[PDB]
Amino acid sequence: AGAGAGMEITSSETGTNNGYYYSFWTDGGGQVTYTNGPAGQYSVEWSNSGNFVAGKGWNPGSSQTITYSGEWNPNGNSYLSVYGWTQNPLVEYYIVESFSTYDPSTGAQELGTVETDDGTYKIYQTTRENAPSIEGTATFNQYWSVRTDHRVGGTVTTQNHFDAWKNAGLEMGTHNYMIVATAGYQSSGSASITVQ
Numbered sequence: 116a117g118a119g120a121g122m123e124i125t126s127s128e129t130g131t132n133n134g135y136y137y138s139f140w141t142d143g144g145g146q147v148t149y150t151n152g153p154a155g156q157y158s159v160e161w162s163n164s165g166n167f168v169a170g171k172g173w174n175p176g177s178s179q180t181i182t183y184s185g186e187w188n189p190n191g192n193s194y195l196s197v198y199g200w201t202q203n204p205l206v207e208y209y210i211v212e213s214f215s216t217y218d219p220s221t222g223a224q225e226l227g228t229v230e231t232d233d234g235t236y237k238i239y240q241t242t243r244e245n246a247p248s249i250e251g252t253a254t255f256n257q258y259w260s261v262r263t264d265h266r267v268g269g270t271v272t273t274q275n276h277f278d279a280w281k282n283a284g285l286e287m288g289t290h291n292y293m294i295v296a297t298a299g300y301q302s303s304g305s306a307s308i309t310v311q
């Protein structure tokens with residue numbers, strides 16, 4: 116955003132900015148700095164981070180087709196994803212467009228694949244126990260769609276992923292937020308992403 120960046124945010128916060136929901140979450144490790152830009156733009160910069168997840172989108176999500184653009188420059192473990200939550204049942208989900216040094220599906224049984232938006236995604240389910248959530252400390256399932264050819268930018272037809280997860284037997288609840296998220300853990304980097 117250059118100058119166009121808003122005030123720097125360094126602790127967890129949510130809101131709506133220029134018509135877009137934003138969620139910034141950090142566990143407090145290292146330094147993580149988030150800024151809202153014009154329209155659907157956000158930037159995040161991080162240095163020896165703990166866990167963080169940040170981005171812009173909608174709350175609630177409604178399975179829309181997402182177009183996003185920008186750049187994503189991690190040095191270490193980071194994911195660029197369409198990211199969100201359902202409630203009842205509580206579910207955290209990821210449509211991973213790129214990951215850097217660590218595959219977040221490691222150790223999970225692959226449940227199938229989905230072909231959409233000129234790529235192929237492998238489908239996984241995991242579980243988090245006594246973990247942070249949009250409802251507080253909780254246990255919940257995580258659903259994953261992990262693109263086989265990593266990219267930064269393009270179109271994500273989220274309904275195709277949700278349909279594929281349901282066909283694989285993965286139940287979704289009522290939609291809470293859905294954002295184009297930059298995530299990191301014990302890494303550094305920067306990203307500047309615009310949700311169109």
Ligand SMILES: O[C@@H]1[C@@H](O)[C@H](O[C@@H]2CO[C@@H](O)[C@H](O)[C@H]2O)OC[C@H]1O
Pocket residue numbers: 138140166167168207243246247248249
């Ligand atoms: O909205 C926030 C969530 O993004 C946060 O989720 C943690 C995000 O990192 C993931 O690796 C974890 O599985 C997940 O627990 O929880 C807090 C909530 O306010």
Ligand SMILES: [Zn+2]
Pocket residue numbers: 213214215265
């Ligand atoms: Zn990659």
Ligand SMILES: [Zn+2]
Pocket residue numbers: 264265266
């Ligand atoms: Zn490629």
